[PDB]
């Protein structure tokens, strides 16, 4: 079946629970997701870089990026695409793409896209 990249708030991620081998918030299966928040704290290591990313919606979340450019300065706004995974009963995001926000409008767009995709998909899942 078909797996879209669902825009989300962190409160949606922290609330999603595992249902038949897949993550679900409301009745929207999620896996690949974008969020938009503000780097509250960077954390360098040679393999990986761990960020604490905050939108409005809850406490900041962990976002891990596996390295191989520079560490995005604490304070900046960013869009993040990644996979929601939970390890020791703690949700984190495995980011493939982390891109400093260019046009703060993209941010509004996100708020709009989240509310929209979640509204559409949850309807589509009936039925």
């Amino acid at each position: 079946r078909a797996q879209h990249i669902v825009p989300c708030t962190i409160s949606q991620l922290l609330s999603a629970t595992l249902v038949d081998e897949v993550f679900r918030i409301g009745n929207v299966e999620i896996s690949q997701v974008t969020i938009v928040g503000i780097i509250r704290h960077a954390e360098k290591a040679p393999t990986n870089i761990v960020y604490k990313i905050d939108d409005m919606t809850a406490a900041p979340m962990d976002v891990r990026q596996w390295v191989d450019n520079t560490v995005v300065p604490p304070e900046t706004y960013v869009k993040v695409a990644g996979h929601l995974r939970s390890f020791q009963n703690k949700k984190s995001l495995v980011a493939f793409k982390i891109m400093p926000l260019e046009d703060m409008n993209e941010f509004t767009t996100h708020i709009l896209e989240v509310i929209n995709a979640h509204m559409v998909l949850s309807k589509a899942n009936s039925q």
């Binding site: 503000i38 809850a58 900046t76 709009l112 979640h118």
Partner: protein, 117 residues
């Protein structure tokens, strides 16, 4: 607390009243800075005013679109615990659109939830 560990609600100034004591997120344009550096005014996407109070006088100068994080006072102002100047340099931020988003956030909390549910 320091509020970075709680949900914060995006509001416009129209909503301050319905939010006393709650943690909030006020995005607005810088209207005036108080001489003391301790207070400042932001106008929302509907052109209405919110008053931001501070603990320490403003560190350096700010303007344009500011995003404030704080607790709504008894007097329905905002005691701010941190703010951010919005990167505006290459494209201007449509404050009016953002205001619609805020409205929509509140017509649809089942789709933009506040805190772990």
């Amino acid at each position: 607390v320091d509020m970075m560990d709680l949900p914060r609600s995006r509001i416009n100034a129209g909503m301050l009243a319905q939010f006393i004591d709650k943690p909030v997120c006020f995005v607005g344009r810088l209207e005036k800075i108080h001489p003391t550096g301790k207070m400042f005014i932001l106008s929302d996407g509907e052109g209405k005013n919110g008053t931001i109070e501070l603990m320490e006088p403003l560190d350096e100068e700010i303007s344009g679109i500011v995003e404030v994080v704080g607790r709504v006072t008894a007097k329905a102002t905002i005691l701010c615990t941190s703010y951010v100047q919005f990167k505006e340099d290459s494209h201007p931020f449509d404050l009016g659109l953002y205001n619609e988003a805020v409205k929509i956030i509140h017509d649809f909390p089942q789709f933009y939830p506040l805190g772990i549910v």
